[PDB]
């Protein structure tokens, strides 16, 4: 037993990582198939902040003006293209280490991994939730532009992140590998701020099942509550709605606890209104709302790749 | 800045976890050079689980006896012997993808990343920290055994610990790669009590530095303390006792913030005798004590 904020294993997603230098400009790219992406801003310089048009910019660059690096091998550009806010770099080689991949999107509320980089060499590893406000909380790092987040199903990477800018209020700000902002942000060099942030009620109530059973069992009672009831609950904590979605993808967690859903609500509501008088679950005083129930599921029950 | 404990990438240890089967019993092995490590344990029985004699166990054994499964391939076992609590299995194959490496021990309050893993299959990466009592807080389920934690400082993966049991307070215990056993635990499923358990102070106070980096200077006050009045007071909220050692350790971190290391033990104090009040230091509504100092300077704090 126990649990933890757990990440997937990285393997696969550091044979991918690169450096890519443009000019004084340093960051990370992602290798995959013979073409780099990383985040269109590496071309960005003071002068040019007085464009509107970022391919009049791109196309002005030579191909060997992009200087990309894996490990100790220089990699030859032979192409450059625009894919919204991502530049793609074609080079010359294929990466021999290219996992099986695909591009996908995701919804806030949802939870991936993100292999943290510092000039093509990667440094860290965590799980984070893409918040409702459409931010990730991140690392104390910066440089970490072009760091991707990903899921792993089977032996497949799903990526679907990748690292643009930091924001004022220390989270961070992204695009999926279409190049597509999570988030009403621009990867312009202007002034932006995150919008006020929720709670995902829907990973609150996982995490309190994880809780039961990992045997934290103390904020459970007799009662249960309405969708309607809660949600006004919810909406005066600043928390997210629950929707009966929320309720059915709960479902397996509810059948092997017996604890039913607006059960486990009427607990919440108690826990949002009295806090937790001075006691923890699973080791902590806030609620958690980073694990997704596909998370709980699958910690409390040893999924391997 | 944001603050969040992350873990060593996985990929060089995943490079090396096997499928050790003895039996009716499979667990993880760790694969390097030609040798394959596990726990000694996966050659009990369901009688051998009080008072096993491993000697007795093992001299009965064949080569053949071990199968050991990297992927799809089978290894060919060569050989095998015990050291301390780890049996240590010759193979016919040197692992291609073994990283540079080393074995350390590790002392109470260090952390490290914990690959754990299933049928020699990877499935999480987590960051934890050795408890003063030698446990650990982990996440291990049936299958995880042989599971291994680790540190890649520059390049070198420092392998300090692998996965032998689950105690009945749902902490785990294990052994360093020398197969020596972090604590007063046992192989064997008699009973065995961790310590109580205790808050490690120096991690506290760091994470505290680390805040005010971040620009949080709320729970400071204006009181410094002597090292023994700060170590009588926080042993009442069962806080590890700081030692110069560790006041020592802490002085980069002090010249950095220009907070003096026993001016921020004041702070503490005030802190365990206020609590947080609804606020939070880093995010967290609790005392963070699993980010050593040199945690902070690996992100360059
Ligand atoms: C980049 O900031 C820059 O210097 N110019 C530009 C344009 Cl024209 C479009 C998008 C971006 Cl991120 C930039
Ligand atoms: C990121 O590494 C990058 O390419 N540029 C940048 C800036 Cl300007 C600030 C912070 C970060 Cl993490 C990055
Ligand atoms: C560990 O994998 C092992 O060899 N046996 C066992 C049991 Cl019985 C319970 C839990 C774990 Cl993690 C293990
Ligand atoms: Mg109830």
Redesign the interface.
């Known amino acids: 037993?126990?649990?933890?904020?757990?990440?997937?294993?990285?393997?696969?997603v550091?044979?991918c990582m690169v450096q890519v230098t443009c000019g004084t400009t340093t960051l990370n790219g992602l290798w995959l198939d013979d073409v780099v992406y990383c985040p269109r801003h590496v071309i960005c310089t003071s002068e040019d902040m007085l464009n509107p048009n970022y391919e009049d910019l791109l196309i002005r660059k030579s191909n060997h003006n992009f200087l990309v690096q894996a490990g100790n091998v220089q990699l030859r550009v032979i192409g450059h293209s625009m894919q919204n806010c991502v530049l793609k770099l074609k080079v010359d080689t294929a990466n021999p280490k290219t996992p099986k991949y695909k591009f996908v999107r995701i919804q806030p509320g949802q939870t991936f991994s993100v292999?943290?980089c510092y000039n093509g060499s990667?440094?860290?590893?965590?799980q984070?939730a893409m918040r409702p406000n459409f931010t990730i909380?991140?690392?104390?790092?910066?440089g970490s532009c072009g760091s991707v987040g990903f899921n792993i199903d089977y032996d497949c990477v799903s990526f679907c992140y990748m690292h643009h800018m930091?924001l004022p209020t220390?989270?961070?700000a992204g695009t999926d590998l279409e190049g597509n902002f999570y988030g009403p942000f621009v990867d312009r060099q202007t002034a932006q701020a995150a919008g006020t942030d929720t709670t995902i009620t829907v990973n609150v109530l996982a995490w309190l099942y994880a809780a039961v059973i990992?045997?934290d069992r103390w904020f459970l009672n007799r009662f249960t509550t309405t969708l309607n009831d809660f949600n006004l609950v919810a909406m005066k904590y600043n928390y997210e709605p629950l929707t009966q979605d929320h309720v059915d993808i709960l479902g397996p967690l509810s059948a092997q606890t017996g604890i039913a859903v607006l059960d486990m609500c009427a607990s919440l509501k108690e826990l949002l209104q009295n806090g937790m008088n001075g006691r923890?679950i699973l080791?902590?005083?806030?609620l958690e709302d980073e694990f997704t129930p596909f998370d709980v599921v699958r910690?409390?029950?040893?999924?391997?790749?």
């Open positions: 037993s126990g649990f933890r904020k757990m990440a997937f294993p990285s393997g696969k550091e044979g292999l943290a990667p440094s860290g590893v965590y984070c909380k991140g690392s104390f790092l910066n930091e220390g989270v961070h990992n045997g923890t080791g902590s005083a806030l910690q409390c029950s040893g999924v391997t790749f």
